[PDB]
Design a protein around this ligand. Structure first.
Ligand SMILES: O=C(CCc1ccccc1)N[C@H](Cc1nc2ccccc2[nH]1)C(=O)O
Length: 145
């Protein structure tokens, strides 16, 4: 299996699933290193973020837990095809990159917070993370290139 990925047993059905402890992705299907990646993301900030302010809200007061529920609800909508990533990033991301449908452009190792960077380099082009926590808040990361 590629970096980060482990096979596991689903507790509900008895079916195998796969999860990645670097990107927090999980999926039923069996899955599948670059110098640079291009990613977009959707940031949800909370009262404990480094800077609890954004273009959406002068004071961010939701808890970390409320931020995690928001993130989980956006992943559900993206995975079901109810909304696409770019639409939710534009409308709801607490990063100013929202204005570019979450696009951060291309970057190499040694530029972004570690947990964001590790998750980005562990995705393959096209794949999306689960909830990735950094000091900024909670992220959904889409690797575009
Ligand atoms: O650092 C920025 C701006 C980054 C950016 C890059 C390219 C285009 C637009 C913004 N904003 C932060 C929120 C934040 N924290 C991050 C950590 C990793 C990646 C993206 C992040 N975004 C904040 O406002 O606290």
């Amino acid at each position: 299996l590629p970096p980060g990925w482990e096979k596991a047993m689903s507790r509900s059905s008895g079916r195998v699933y796969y999860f990645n402890h670097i990107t927090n992705a999980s999926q039923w299907e069996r899955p599948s290193e670059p110098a640079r990646v291009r990613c977009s993301h959707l940031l949800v900030k909370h009262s404990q973020s480094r800077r609890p302010s954004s273009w959406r809200q002068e004071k961010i007061t939701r808890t970390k837990e409320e931020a995690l529920e928001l993130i989980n609800g956006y992943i559900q909508k993206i995975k079901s095809g109810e909304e696409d990533f770019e639409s939710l990033a534009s409308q709801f991301s607490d990063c100013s990159s929202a204005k570019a449908r979450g696009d951060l452009g291309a970057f190499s190792r040694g530029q972004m917070a570690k947990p964001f960077e590790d998750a980005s380099f562990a995705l393959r082009t096209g794949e999306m993370s689960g909830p990735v926590f950094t000091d900024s808040g909670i992220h959904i990361i889409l690797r575009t290139e």
